[PDB]
Design a binder for this molecule. Sequence first.
Ligand code: HEM
Ligand code: HEM
Ligand code: HEM
Ligand code: HEM
Ligand code: HEM
Ligand code: HEM
Ligand code: HEM
Ligand code: HEM
Ligand code: HEM
Ligand SMILES: *[C@@H]1O[C@H](CO)[C@@H](O)[C@H](O)[C@H]1NC(C)=O
Ligand SMILES: [C-]#N
Ligand SMILES: [C-]#N
Ligand SMILES: [C-]#N
Ligand SMILES: [C-]#N
Ligand SMILES: [C-]#N
Ligand SMILES: [C-]#N
Ligand SMILES: [C-]#N
Ligand SMILES: [C-]#N
Ligand SMILES: [C-]#N
Ligand SMILES: [Zn+2]
Lengths: 151, 151, 151, 59, 109, 148, 148, 142, 142, 141, 141
Amino acid sequence: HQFCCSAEDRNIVQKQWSVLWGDTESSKVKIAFGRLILTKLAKEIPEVKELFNKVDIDNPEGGPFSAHCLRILNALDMSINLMDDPEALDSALDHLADQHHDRPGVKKAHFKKIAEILHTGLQQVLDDYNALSWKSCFKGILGKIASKLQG
Amino acid sequence: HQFCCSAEDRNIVQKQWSVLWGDTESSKVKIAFGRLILTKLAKEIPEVKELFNKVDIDNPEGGPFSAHCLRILNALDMSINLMDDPEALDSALDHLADQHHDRPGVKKAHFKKIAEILHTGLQQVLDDYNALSWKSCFKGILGKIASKLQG
Amino acid sequence: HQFCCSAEDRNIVQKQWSVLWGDTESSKVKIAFGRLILTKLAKEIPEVKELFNKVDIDNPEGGPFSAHCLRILNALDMSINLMDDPEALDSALDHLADQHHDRPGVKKAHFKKIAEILHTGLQQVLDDYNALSWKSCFKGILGKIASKLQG
Amino acid sequence: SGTSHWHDCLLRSDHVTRVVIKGTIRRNYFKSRIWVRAQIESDLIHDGKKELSDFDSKG
Amino acid sequence: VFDHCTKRRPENITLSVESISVAAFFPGFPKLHVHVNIHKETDEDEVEVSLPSDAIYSFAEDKLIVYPSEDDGLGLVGQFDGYNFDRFVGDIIHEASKEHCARFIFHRK
Amino acid sequence: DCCSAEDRREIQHIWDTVWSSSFTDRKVAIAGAVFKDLFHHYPSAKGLFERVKVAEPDSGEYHSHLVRVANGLDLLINLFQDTQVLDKQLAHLAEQHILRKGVTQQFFKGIGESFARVFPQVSSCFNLEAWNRCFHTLADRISRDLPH
Amino acid sequence: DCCSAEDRREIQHIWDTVWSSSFTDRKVAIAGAVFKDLFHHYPSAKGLFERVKVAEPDSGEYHSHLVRVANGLDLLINLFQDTQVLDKQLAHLAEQHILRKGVTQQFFKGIGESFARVFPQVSSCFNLEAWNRCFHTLADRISRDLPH
Amino acid sequence: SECDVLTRLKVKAQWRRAYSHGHNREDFAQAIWRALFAQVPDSRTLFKRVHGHDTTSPEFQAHALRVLAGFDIAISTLDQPDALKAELDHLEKQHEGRHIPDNYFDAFKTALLHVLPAQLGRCWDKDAWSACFDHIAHGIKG
Amino acid sequence: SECDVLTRLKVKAQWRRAYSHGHNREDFAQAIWRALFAQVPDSRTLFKRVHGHDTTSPEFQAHALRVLAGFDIAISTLDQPDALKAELDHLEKQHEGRHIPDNYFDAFKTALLHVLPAQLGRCWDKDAWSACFDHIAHGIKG
Amino acid sequence: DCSILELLKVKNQWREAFGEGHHRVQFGLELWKRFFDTHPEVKGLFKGVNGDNIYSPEFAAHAERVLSGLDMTIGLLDDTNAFKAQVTHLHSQHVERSINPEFYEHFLGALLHVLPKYLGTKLDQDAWTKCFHTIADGIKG
Amino acid sequence: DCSILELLKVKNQWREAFGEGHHRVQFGLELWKRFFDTHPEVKGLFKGVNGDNIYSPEFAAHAERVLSGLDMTIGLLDDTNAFKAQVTHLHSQHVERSINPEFYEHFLGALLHVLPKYLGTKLDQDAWTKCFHTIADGIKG
Ligand code: HEM
Ligand code: HEM
Ligand code: HEM
Ligand code: HEM
Ligand code: HEM
Ligand code: HEM
Ligand code: HEM
Ligand code: HEM
Ligand code: HEM
Ligand SMILES: *[C@@H]1O[C@H](CO)[C@@H](O)[C@H](O)[C@H]1NC(C)=O
Ligand SMILES: [C-]#N
Ligand SMILES: [C-]#N
Ligand SMILES: [C-]#N
Ligand SMILES: [C-]#N
Ligand SMILES: [C-]#N
Ligand SMILES: [C-]#N
Ligand SMILES: [C-]#N
Ligand SMILES: [C-]#N
Ligand SMILES: [C-]#N
Ligand SMILES: [Zn+2]
């Protein structure tokens, strides 16, 4: 619905997000950013690092973890690009919630933290960043992804 | 389509294949050849022998396994004779793919092996053997039969 | 033909050449430039000065020689403007070759020299000068003018 | 058929060009586009006499 | 009639005569510009084709020779009955092996 | 785009209009042209033939070499309907080429290209597509087990 | 077959699909491939690039070198519509190459060939003819005053 | 052709041109899907969970986008073989258990290879795309 | 096109196919002649000595055959430039003194280039034939 | 301390200023105009390239070389090995000339002065100074 | 002493026996069958190519190579330079193997025995022996 993550909010978010991926090695940037966010999350809340054992987080420069950072960054990209279509966005976010439910140990507090980390990083990388719109929208996105968590 | 197992390719294959079955005890030859191929496959890839437990492969001279060798050889004969009619051939091969799908444990690698064994044997028994045409066509045939396999 | 003095080459040459003649006293500039080129040629190859005796080169500020500098500069202007139409250009250049043939003592080496002088001057006066295109084209132009020379 | 007027790349005078449609493929699983094959012919009066300049093309 | 070499393996082929050039000094072998038109509709697609080709007619042999336009050795040769001229047999032949691999019965439309 | 039986029959048929004589002149001329093309496009390969005197292209040694090639190709094409024998001869030729160091698969792709460039110049109704599809088959067997 | 204005505009346009990034990965990969080709065809030249650790080719030193080349070529191409500046930079690059003994004109022809071999593999609609006609221009200026 | 270091670079660049600008991305995806289902309509039953009966449904849009995202990771890592292997293993796990004939993968390939040149419209190489798709698909199958 | 080493080889092979089998050879010759005289009938006066008025006369048959023999030497030696130059000089001497306009040589060429594909009927190259004929004719003229 | 986000930002803004060929030349020339305007003590170093005349071909070619090298280093900011190698290569190209090590601070000054005129975004001065210094540090002995 | 008419004749008859692909294979195989029948002492030399089994692919490919080389030499009979070069090339291919130089006479024997079965004309034995010897002489040291 309107006001909280409105149409213009979504337009701002998409327009500003688009700035990052200018060149042909966007994969490099996505991996770097994802690695940053994730390792920072593992530092802030140490109990989290164990949850990424299957993607080899202990070797963040490694293949598996890089591919995984691409996974999250592409999910984030997808969800941002899907903000035009609320129903499709809702469906995709729902699938993500399902996926994070099947990983026991993942908690809502982790999502609160990663929200903080995310906004902090975006303030740096993005030259133009409307915090009101971004936070308005990501409250709902991250909210929906963490909505099916047991804890 | 043309080039890969062309019209002339099919003519060659049929003409050369026809040489084997000259006399009235063609059944004896089909059973011998099928038994050879199959037991050789079971030797090359030992995990395969278990798959033929229901046709009594442990007694290859036995009734059930002989009748079964007739089954495969006749399927092969049929598919060769059907190369004039691509649509009918496709339908028959599809039925075979269905049948091999219902046998869990059957894998594409087995078909690769049996292709090798088949061509090696045919080089011996057939006095006139155009390897290019035969391999061109059987790539497609065995391909289609193994097309519905899980592994 | 293409590559050597191509269509775009000619476009560049014309566009850049157009810059010189902005105002109403273009005649003054043509005379100055022609006088410069010619006297420089007479200095570089002293045997040349005698050839311009009939146009009073010894008084380069004089009437006859000024009118003559206008003659050459206008022939050059014409040949540049005619580069759109290869056949007409060829005809005009041919007429020029005829005219320079009727002046015994004029040699191809003189044209090589005046080519050098020309390009050196143009590098200065023109603010935008694509040497590749200019040299590509003038090789052909000066080539054709000097094509009917005995020496 | 039409007249080609050149102003770049080549130094040709105005001349006839023909686009000759030679074939089309339209996949029933992707009708959004038709895949065309064609012959491009040009009548060039290059060196006193006439000469055809043609080539095979696809798009 | 039969066919095992043509690209599209069509049901029917339309041969359209577009022009005829007869050299006054050599009238026995007129040159034709013709188009071979094929229209084949399979499951995966629908294909239509109009292949411009050069041909010669031989009065001596009552025979049309259509030189191939595509990148196969496939030429069309129409043999006339000698008396009909509203029907010919069109054999498709490999320009090289001389192998006869397709035949169509053509009628004047 | 495999090498069909039709392609092989085609090549076998057209083959007697490209060289093929009781005299070697056409073989020398045409094969010679093939190599002029090859060396033009991959000049590094020209060094591999000093043993046969490429530097003197009119020498008996180089001529005889060209003829050896031409006849080798002849042998290959003649064996198109005898796949077993073709396989053995293909292997033989392959080892003959393994003994020569510096001969790569890239050079083989190159010579395929030059053949395809030369043959249609010496005979009309030469099926280029067929030639390409079949050469790929021959060369890929000769040139495997060579540096890539 | 000179280097036309069209050729230069062409090269300038296609150029941003061959490497060109805020990251050096593509430059390293492609230039690296160019040199693999060069050394494959003219192995004697491989000895010159040690200082740069040619020998260990994952050495920051060799990478940085490849990037230096790529960017040098970038600089050259960007100067295609500034003939005076192009001339000065061409001279500069030339002297930089004269300081290195053992670098010949033949090696330059070679690298032209390898560029022409590599570029069409990394981007479609790459005008090879234009590239050749223009490279000849660049190299013949860089590599004059060197030894054949 | 085969999936060289170079032709991988080519495919990677072209995929950048086709996918990276989230405008018509869901439409690109859906075009691919209409083509696939047009070739092998029996495959729609595999996608009941995600509304394969209606490719305009939000659930199926979300799906097709998930797909293109995975494929994007795969293409993006063609020059990073460790990561490529990782993503391919991941996709393989996501696909094992599902009875998917080679048939359907050929349908997917043909779909992609018809929508791609429609998207780019210009400079593209169907052989490089064929090779690299074959590599990725082989990775997903096993 | 131009008379390459290669296209010379092509012309040579095709000429073998057309001329070398003395069956319809005098008829081939005479066809060429009927075409030539059809184009430029005024040229018949040059052949009074050899009965140009009746191309079926034995004297003119003998003639046309002499011609085709000379032309055969010329074609046969396209790959032997010394010999070719020799035969061309010889023909030139045999033709000097006779007032033969380029006109007539073009007639001859056109005749040959129409009878040839009628003879071969199959694989032939009019461009190669054009080039090599031009070479031989230039040789005969000077 | 030129971290991931720093070098990412600098990479982006650099792409803005240098990635467009239509204003790359103006950028270089204006950088130099500013540098020489505010620190004419520096001009002596560039006699080899007509530093007294920045509108000359010699100096133009120079500025082009500069921006090229700067592009290389900014682009290698994430590859530590190749970075160090490139920066020591730059070092070799500068150590022979008696260059006051505080001239690099002035260079950065001119760079930061000219940059926003070619940036559609707001200049991240922190990121730029940090990365520029991790470069200059390596260039200097 | 293999003169013009000799080599012309041998060329023609060779074209008869080898120029037709439908009986080239029979020709080669029968040549070998005869050779090995009348001189089994020779078979040891061909262990590399299953000389004990002429109906095998190995030996077939061999016989094919033989006839090909023989074709080359017969075809170079008129080009003395290229001839000598080709014959020394054949020499290099035979010198490594301890081959009794009178085995070549036996080879010629089998050749002359098998040839008329594939000739529509009468075998010119003089021309054939003369040319075969001018070949073998060069093959031998
Ligand atoms: C920033 C918003 C987030 C997004 C967009 C996101 C997205 C994703 C995606 C796309 C996957 C891949 C699943 C698959 O393909 O199988 C994944 C996996 C996973 N997520 Fe996240 N996630 C987010 C936040 C979080 C948080 C806060 C946690 C708590 C630590 C978390 C924990 C995990 C774990 C443990 C996996 C396991 C992956 C594996 O084992 O293969 N995620 N996430
Ligand atoms: C060479 C091409 C092959 C042909 C033409 C062929 C044909 C057949 C046929 C006709 C049957 C009878 C099915 C029925 O009537 O119920 C059969 C059964 C079977 N096939 Fe094959 N087959 C081929 C290759 C393979 C290979 C490579 C495998 C791998 C081990 C395999 C595994 C089996 C198994 C396990 C059965 C079950 C037989 C039973 O228990 O009754 N087949 N095959
Ligand atoms: C730069 C290309 C040149 C052009 C466009 C050019 C053009 C002309 C023209 C238009 C005339 C006037 C002829 C008339 O109107 O009757 C002329 C005269 C003449 N030119 Fe040039 N010229 C060129 C280069 C040269 C050079 C290199 C020489 C060698 C000295 C030369 C020698 C002469 C001489 C001796 C005359 C006779 C002067 C007179 O009696 O009026 N020209 N030229
Ligand atoms: C088109 C397929 C080719 C065929 C059929 C062929 C045929 C032959 C033959 C018959 C020989 C003589 C071997 C002997 O007499 O023992 C030979 C030798 C040789 N080949 Fe090829 N060749 C082919 C392609 C190539 C290519 C692409 C290269 C790379 C440059 C190459 C490099 C060589 C070399 C260096 C020799 C040694 C010749 C000598 O030193 O006497 N070949 N080849
Ligand atoms: C395609 C035109 C070429 C360009 C644009 C180019 C570019 C460059 C550049 C930018 C450098 C760095 C010099 C410096 O920064 O001090 C360099 C160095 C060098 N060049 Fe080239 N190069 C080219 C062709 C060649 C060729 C064909 C060779 C012959 C193998 C060659 C041999 C060398 C050597 C030996 C060095 C020394 C590198 C070092 O010591 O660090 N260059 N080149
Ligand atoms: C190489 C091309 C393909 C790629 C990159 C790909 C990738 C994917 C991805 C990313 C998912 C999402 C799974 C998840 O998020 O857990 C998925 C699911 C799925 N794929 Fe594929 N796939 C490909 C080809 C195919 C083929 C040809 C089929 C056969 C029609 C197929 C059948 C399925 C099915 C049935 C699902 C799950 C549907 C559901 O969630 O209900 N895929 N695939
Ligand atoms: C390249 C094509 C031609 C060839 C090969 C050719 C060759 C010959 C030959 C072999 C002869 C016989 C001379 C002798 O043995 O005494 C001859 C004679 C002659 N040619 Fe040609 N010629 C050609 C074209 C022409 C042309 C175009 C004409 C002009 C109509 C022409 C006019 C004549 C005449 C008038 C004679 C002598 C008639 C006579 O014997 O009384 N020829 N030529
Ligand atoms: C991190 C910022 C800088 C970078 C990236 C840089 C890079 C470069 C490059 C690439 C060259 C050309 C190398 C050659 O071919 O010789 C160069 C030359 C030079 N640099 Fe710098 N430089 C920087 C800062 C400075 C500073 C602060 C000074 C002191 C004014 C300076 C003084 C010079 C001089 C005098 C030359 C050579 C002049 C000549 O060749 O005639 N540079 N620099
Ligand atoms: C003038 C008649 C002969 C000709 C034209 C001829 C030609 C050839 C040729 C082309 C080869 C294959 C070269 C290769 O290995 O690539 C060969 C191999 C050989 N020849 Fe002869 N040869 C002749 C006479 C003989 C004689 C009389 C003997 C003695 C029995 C002999 C014994 C052998 C042997 C043992 C080999 C190699 C077997 C192998 O390849 O494993 N040849 N010869
Ligand atoms: C050609 O064939 C199709 C059926 O195969 C038919 O519908 C069409 O009308 C035919 N055209 C003619 C003129 O026979
Ligand atoms: C998040 N993984
Ligand atoms: C399966 N037999
Ligand atoms: C100059 N006149
Ligand atoms: C190959 N010689
Ligand atoms: C050069 N590097
Ligand atoms: C696919 N899913
Ligand atoms: C001609 N006679
Ligand atoms: C630095 N200049
Ligand atoms: C030889 N044998
Ligand atoms: Zn038409």
